[PDB]
Ligand binder design. Sequence first.
Ligand SMILES: [Fe+3]
Ligand SMILES: [Fe+3]
Ligand SMILES: [Fe+3]
Ligand SMILES: [Fe+3]
Ligand SMILES: [Fe+3]
Ligand SMILES: [Fe+3]
Ligand SMILES: [Fe+3]
Ligand SMILES: [Fe+3]
Lengths: 170, 170, 170, 170, 170, 170, 170, 170, 170, 170, 170, 170
Amino acid sequence: IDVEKLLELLIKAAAAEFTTYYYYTILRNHATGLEGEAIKEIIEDARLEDRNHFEALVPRIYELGGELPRDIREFADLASCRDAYLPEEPTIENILKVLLEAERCAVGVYTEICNYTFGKDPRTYDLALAILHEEIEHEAWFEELLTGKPSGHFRRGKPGESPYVSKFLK
Amino acid sequence: IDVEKLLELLIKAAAAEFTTYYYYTILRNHATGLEGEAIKEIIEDARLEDRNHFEALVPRIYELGGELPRDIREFADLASCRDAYLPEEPTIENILKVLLEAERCAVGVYTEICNYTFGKDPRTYDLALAILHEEIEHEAWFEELLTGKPSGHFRRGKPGESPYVSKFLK
Amino acid sequence: IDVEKLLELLIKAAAAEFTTYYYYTILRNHATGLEGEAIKEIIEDARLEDRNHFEALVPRIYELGGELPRDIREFADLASCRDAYLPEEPTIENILKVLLEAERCAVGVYTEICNYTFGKDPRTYDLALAILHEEIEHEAWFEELLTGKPSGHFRRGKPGESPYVSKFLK
Amino acid sequence: IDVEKLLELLIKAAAAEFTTYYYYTILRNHATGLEGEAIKEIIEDARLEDRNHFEALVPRIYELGGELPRDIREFADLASCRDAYLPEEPTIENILKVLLEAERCAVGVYTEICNYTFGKDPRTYDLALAILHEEIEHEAWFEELLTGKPSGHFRRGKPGESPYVSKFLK
Amino acid sequence: IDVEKLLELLIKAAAAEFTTYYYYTILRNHATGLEGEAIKEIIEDARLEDRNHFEALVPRIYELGGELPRDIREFADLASCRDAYLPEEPTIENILKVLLEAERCAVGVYTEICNYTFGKDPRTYDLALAILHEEIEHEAWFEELLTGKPSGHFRRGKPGESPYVSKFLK
Amino acid sequence: IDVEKLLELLIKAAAAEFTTYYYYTILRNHATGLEGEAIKEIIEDARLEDRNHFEALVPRIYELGGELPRDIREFADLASCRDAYLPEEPTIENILKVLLEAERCAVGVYTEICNYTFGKDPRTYDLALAILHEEIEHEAWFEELLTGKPSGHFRRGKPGESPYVSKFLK
Amino acid sequence: IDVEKLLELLIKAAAAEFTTYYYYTILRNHATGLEGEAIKEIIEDARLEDRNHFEALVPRIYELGGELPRDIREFADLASCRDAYLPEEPTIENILKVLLEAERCAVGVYTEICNYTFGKDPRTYDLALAILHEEIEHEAWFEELLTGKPSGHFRRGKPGESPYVSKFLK
Amino acid sequence: IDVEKLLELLIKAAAAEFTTYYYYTILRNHATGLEGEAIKEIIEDARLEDRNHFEALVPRIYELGGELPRDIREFADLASCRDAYLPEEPTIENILKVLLEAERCAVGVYTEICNYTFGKDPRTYDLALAILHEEIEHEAWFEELLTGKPSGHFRRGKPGESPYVSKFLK
Amino acid sequence: IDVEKLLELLIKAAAAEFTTYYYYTILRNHATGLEGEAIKEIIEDARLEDRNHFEALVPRIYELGGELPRDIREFADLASCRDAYLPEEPTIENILKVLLEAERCAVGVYTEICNYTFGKDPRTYDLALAILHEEIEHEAWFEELLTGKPSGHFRRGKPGESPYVSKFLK
Amino acid sequence: IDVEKLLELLIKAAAAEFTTYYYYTILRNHATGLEGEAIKEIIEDARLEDRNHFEALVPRIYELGGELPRDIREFADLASCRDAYLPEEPTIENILKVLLEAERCAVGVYTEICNYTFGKDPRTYDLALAILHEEIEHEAWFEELLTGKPSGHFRRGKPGESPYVSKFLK
Amino acid sequence: IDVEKLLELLIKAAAAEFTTYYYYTILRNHATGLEGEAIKEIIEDARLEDRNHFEALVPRIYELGGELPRDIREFADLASCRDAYLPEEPTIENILKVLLEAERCAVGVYTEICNYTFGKDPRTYDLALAILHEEIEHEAWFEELLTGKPSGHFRRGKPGESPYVSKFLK
Amino acid sequence: IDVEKLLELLIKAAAAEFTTYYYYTILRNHATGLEGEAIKEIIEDARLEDRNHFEALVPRIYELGGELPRDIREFADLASCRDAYLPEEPTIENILKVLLEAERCAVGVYTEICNYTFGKDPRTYDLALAILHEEIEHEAWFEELLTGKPSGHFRRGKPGESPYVSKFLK
Ligand SMILES: [Fe+3]
Ligand SMILES: [Fe+3]
Ligand SMILES: [Fe+3]
Ligand SMILES: [Fe+3]
Ligand SMILES: [Fe+3]
Ligand SMILES: [Fe+3]
Ligand SMILES: [Fe+3]
Ligand SMILES: [Fe+3]
């Protein structure tokens, strides 16, 4: 494995998770009214688990000899996803669209990392797989709410449970 | 008490609970969208408690000298209720209709067993009464969601609590 | 501080909390249907915390040399708020209107008590402040549900948590 | 069963429990001195369990198609017991007399409901029986304290345990 | 109900439970070897739950105006069962025979009490029913071990759980 | 990956787990006598974990765009294993034979799914691997009991622990 | 050590604890009125810990090759203490006298066993010492209540804690 | 704020709490007999919470640049209260008099500190307020026991709970 | 109070906390070697509590009618503190210098907010006071490590305890 | 006490415990079949508690100025017991013979240490006594399984409880 | 035993523990800087356990008919150790010297008490032994930190665990 | 896969873990002084997790048809690592060198096993991967302490947590 490339991938994914922890706060606060109370706890579940994803990526970055960038704006500019901005018309459907685009991008990032470390770096692969479980379940929550396609998921009992990444957490 | 008749009643009710544990899984997965997120945890609450009802009926069946049937298809064909099939147009209102018919039938089954063992078999009566509490509360949840008639119930804190049948559970 | 005036304020506020514990029960039971399941746990959260507010006001009343009135009808007639009556047309929006008027009055009562005991009676001030936190958060829940204005609150994990008044509770 | 009669009985008993939750607060605060510290926790135990009795009666009332009355004064005027007023000479013995009259009336109310729903409405019967256990134990506590007749009861570990009605509570 | 007769029944049953708590200790210690390790935890489960049965009968005896007899030998001589003596040849099969005779007698005692208080004394009936659940499950454990007839019971997780009588325990 | 083939494999394996949850109940109840008490908790451990396997397979099926079949008999007819029928001579050795054939088939099913999704679908692979851990340990328990070959496993502390699949459970 | 003598001492002390568990039940129920509520929890604390003393003595008896006697009346007749009979005039002071005589005898029994096994049988010595701690604290509770001599003890948080003998308990 | 003056106040109050932790031990041990068992747990509650007050004052003293005095006798000589000496005639009423004088002095000390840091040092003010809550509740317990004036307080569940100062404790 | 000014103050302080949560991660990772292991848990304690400070500021911002800025770079540019950059020579002493400058600035920010809302906005004042407690204790930890001045603080038991702000957290 | 002799005794006993932790693993894995499932948890209980014995001996060795030997083979060669080798014919009875010889030797080792430190080194004596309790109970388990002599012991609830040595453990 | 001599020894040792609880607070606060953070939790562990030693000595003093002295200065003047004064040059090494002298004196005090009550007063002996365990482990912590001699101890998980004296604590 | 080769690898790795559990005890005890207290808990964390690694390897060895060797010296001679001997000059830096060589060897062993079972034996691969996570984190702890290279790890909350291997543990 070319380890500088994996370090770029991992830093970009961790910037995606950190920015996501911010933008989801904003999105959570605008899920308002009767429809929004339905999706608020789900946004909060995804936001806390994603910040846990950041908390799991950083130790692996420093394991491989990389560092987080000096400036937090450099970090934000490195995000592998685009910013989950609040829509101009922040309806519940428009917000769900933004959240679904974010978790679809996140699934792709971690699929890319797993397809990079498969049979080559088992620790990073296992970590990217653990985050990929939770990003797939994030995408399913928001795609069932926005489109109605049944994907059989439930709401975590408490936000930030992160059942698949917890063994990388303290 | 004619104990073969009570054994038929109890086996038929346990087949109702086992099939219900399956069909409610299917119904749970199709409660989708913004309206469905409202009723999903309630379907899950009823599904887990009903499978707990099966888990409480089987020991009493073997107490009285009966057995579950050899083949699982024989068992399913013995269900005292009709199959809670997914409706052809699986809207939230049509699904609530199916769930309400299932829990109304279940209330009738356990009313029948209690009216059979009253003053005659106190253990089976107490057990049928404990399940009857939870089936009455299932019916009330779904009738408040479908019709709006206030029956004063809340959502269990965690699915499968089964507060009335727990003392028959392990 | 004129302590008979503070005792009137505190008794009137405790009658507001006790009556509110009753009327919110009624309002909780009529939050029915698909929209009402969304607001039921929020009504229950506010009802239990408000009865906890009564449970915190009574010890301070007897600290200052006051008593609850002999007759429970005298007590109800002393409520600093108006009765959160069930609306003639008990829709979800009309019920939210009633709940929001009740929690807006409650915020005003406890603002008045804090503006009375500020720098003068620190124990009563701290207690009125603790209740005022929870009444402000009640008002925000119901104003976000009724109007959509984002005020950034979540649902307590379990009803009656009363995180700000708990240190006055047993 | 004539269900309007059972609804009257159940509403009157729930008004008895709600008023009792108020009047026992007052009685608790006047159990003072060296003798009163002995009976205070017992008054608190009975007060919290009785308010739990109210919390268990209301869901059954709305199950059967009844409602709590619109006005809280109507409710108080419906109490099946007389008001546990603070005695004119509020000695420990006079207060125990009042508490014993209240719990003797409560035992009679729930005996009446059980004698009404026996073999006829098993859910309401089971609920009235669960409250009747705790009202019998309330009467025994206060009759042992006032007269010395041994009835073999202990103090609940924590107030409001309600071991017999808990399965109807949330 | 003739209450002196019910007091005799209840005192005799409580002597049965107290003596049983002793004799089961002895029987537990002689369940030795490879076969006995299988039945030891089951003997211990039944012994602790039976002593819990004594702990639940005594408060009801003093509720009804009765007392335990002055002398512990009078008490032992009042046991409604015969003494679960260690067999002359204390094999695992002979010990199981003794345990099964004891729990069959206990089922009969509590069936007799329930058939006495049915529709007449609901508190004592509920208590006798709760003990009767656990005595029926004791009989089933020992009859499955001695004869092999399937009655579908499992081993309690911890001895003395007493899931049916716990609400009468402190 | 041809996703309809993986959906067939996953539905067939989930029917195997659901039928197994039924048939193991029956097998559990006939593990009787002194020898059977030894294997009962082990049957119960495997039965509960297998029903947990069903509870983990269904969300992945609806993730991939599949559904459980409409009718529960269709589902049972799709089981990748043969029915763990009670043997004609239900001795402890014959029952162990049936249980060992069932868990050997289950190991083969999940080996097949893992050999299908390896390096191709990491979420389904991880899930099939988690179930495969527990099916390998089921096979080892029953092969040590039936043949005596040491495979170094212990009994789970509580049934249905499912230590490897729990992160897919709620 | 002459081990038959130590076995006599240990069997006599265990009969003292078993009879005490009975007689303290009776004494507990007659600690009535305002004064008795003060001493009831203390009687209950001593009763449960003493029955725990029986539960710790029996394993050591069977360790040393002894057995509990065949008949429970033989056992009661072997008690190293005299029977804590209910006094003819069962006042709170007379009951405290009886309880203090019982715990003074118990302190003497275990002092005798410790003075027997000192430097000779360390396991039995440690066990007799652990019971002797709790019997000394029982005597101090009852001597402070009856005479007022300060011995600095508090009430255990929950009855039957047995902090010194717990490591011999299961 | 003149910070040396606040440091004197805080050191004097912490010496009051440390000496109080000693003298309350002595007072606790002499609350003997039937009346004293009533007040013992209340003395223990106040003693442990007061030693917790010392544990909260010391970090704030070292925050502000002060130190505890070198010698423990200097410290004791700095106590803002007078020594809660055991009365010459240590009756329950005389001991309650001493305890009430101590907690009345403590309320005055912390009122003085709060009136010093109000709007000037918010951390010390909040800390002095938290201790002042618990000292007001100490005074109320002892004034209700000694005089009978109802102040509506209960006994903490466990000694040293310190619900208001706990957030300053470790 | 001019509420736009308080909203600026609160948004700037929340940007300080969010950036601090990032920069402290970086600082935590470079506290290396034998000296750094001493300060790592303290950096982690401060980092988690500061991110909790962000989690408490956002609900109050949306209460007062403000919002977090659309872009995360705008947010970072609004931080009331300067960026806790990793020093060019990242020794343990240089890192402690940076951490101490950050927590000294944070103490000043929250002193400014409290001096703004004192007697004017009690909810925001209480919140700013709760954060100010934890920022004062952060400054004391780092000033004791860097200079040796005794300020009497200990290490929180687990990172992110936030004992003073927890009642604002979920 | 000659402390080099006590250090030899303690090092030899700790080598006995460490080797025993290995050999019991092997013995545990060969307790197979229907008889072996009975004794497996008992072997596991003894193995974990014995490794806990090693964990308690090492701190006392370094207290007295001794060390564990440099090489792990030197350590194994110092074991005060002989190696609990797997028997050539590893039947359940032959394995029980080996386990009983090991725990009989262990009882003798710790009897020797206690007879060495009695009245001379109280810390080491107390530690050797705590291990001696658990070794006596190990011997009793295996002697009841192999010979049937009743010694009145039960199975620890969870392996490695070590109730007597836990206060020396971390 | 001459009990006045043992009472002197026990009162002097309890004054040593109480003064130590004060002086260790002071010593804890001056363990500053990078080296001091290493020893702070160890000082806190010893300080809390020593105050627990005081909490265990007082009940035994009042058991034997002794009392704590009337005045707290008399008590401090009775300390069996010398005052653990802050050194004139309070370096980490000088502070460790003071702490090691204090715990060496404490080991000698409790060795003296055990050598006094050996075979003569088993309760006091057991108590002095329990404190002597913890004082030996205190001495080992400080002697390993000051000199480097390996004595194999670890840091208690939480301060004031007091694993050996806890059974004397409430 | 050639299964005898994998059995050699797994037995050699389990001997590495068992010997490591011994040698780390020795290394832990010599991490003395002010610097050593910093690294002691980290040595203890690694030692307990490594012994947990042994506890996870043995069941997989007996799954695959292998056994631990008859003699514990044969086992030690099979260790895939070299013995982590105490250095001749046991400074903190020399001890860290030894620990880092041990965990670097362990990372290589488990990398070798994973590179052997990849896509071939998924259970053993998953197990070797779980141990490899914890061995990589062991190496990072010791390399950050010895060299200062930031690898972003923290100290486990309690020793032997083994977050990655726990699902293989009981
Ligand atoms: Fe993410
Ligand atoms: Fe059902
Ligand atoms: Fe019984
Ligand atoms: Fe006793
Ligand atoms: Fe104080
Ligand atoms: Fe901050
Ligand atoms: Fe000490
Ligand atoms: Fe390892």
